[PDB]
Amino acid sequence: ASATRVIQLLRNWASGRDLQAKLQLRYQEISKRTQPPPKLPVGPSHKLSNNYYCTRDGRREAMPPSIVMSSQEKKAVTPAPPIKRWELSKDQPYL
């Protein structure tokens, strides 16, 4: 960091870039390992007002597959609209 300036020019010149700006290892910048206690939020349906499970029944609201045709003038359709050709990159199209 420890490293004297003459070494730093050698590293900077050989790699063609400045490295003291950002280094592979860590330093004092990291958050201290004794962060204050948190106060985690509550659930959206944590209210003690109207909160009946009769409303949210994700497991129970599931329905067996819908019967559409069973063994026991027309149009032509596709399972979805054909995909759209996305444009090139705006920041850098040709790398």
Partner 1 sequence: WDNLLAVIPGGSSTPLIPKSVCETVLMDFDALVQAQTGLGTAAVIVMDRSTDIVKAIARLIEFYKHESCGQCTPCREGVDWMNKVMARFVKGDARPAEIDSLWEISKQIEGHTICALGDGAAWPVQGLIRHFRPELEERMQQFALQHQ
Partner 2 sequence: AGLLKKTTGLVGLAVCETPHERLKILYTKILDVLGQIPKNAAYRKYTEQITNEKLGMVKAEPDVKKLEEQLQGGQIEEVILQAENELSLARKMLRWKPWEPLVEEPPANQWKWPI
Ligand X SMILES: CCCCCCCCCCCCCCCCCC(=O)OC[C@H](COP(=O)([O-])OCC(O)COP(=O)([O-])OC[C@@H](COC(=O)CCCCCCCCCCCCCCCCC)OC(=O)CCCCCCCCCCCCCCCCC)OC(=O)CCCCCCCCCCCCCCCCC
The answer to whether 19 touches 11, Cβ cutoff 8 Å, is yes
Region of 33-41, 44-52, 68-76, 85-93 interacting with partner 1 (CB under 8 A): 44-52
Site for ligand X in 2-31 (CB under 6 A): 2-4, 6-7
The token pair that represents 76 in the structure block: 């032509």
The answer to whether 10 touches 19, Cβ cutoff 8 Å, is no
Q: Which of 14, 67, 76, 95 binds partner 2 (CB under 8 A)?
A: 76
Site residues for partner 2 per CB under 8 A: 71-72, 74, 76, 82, 85
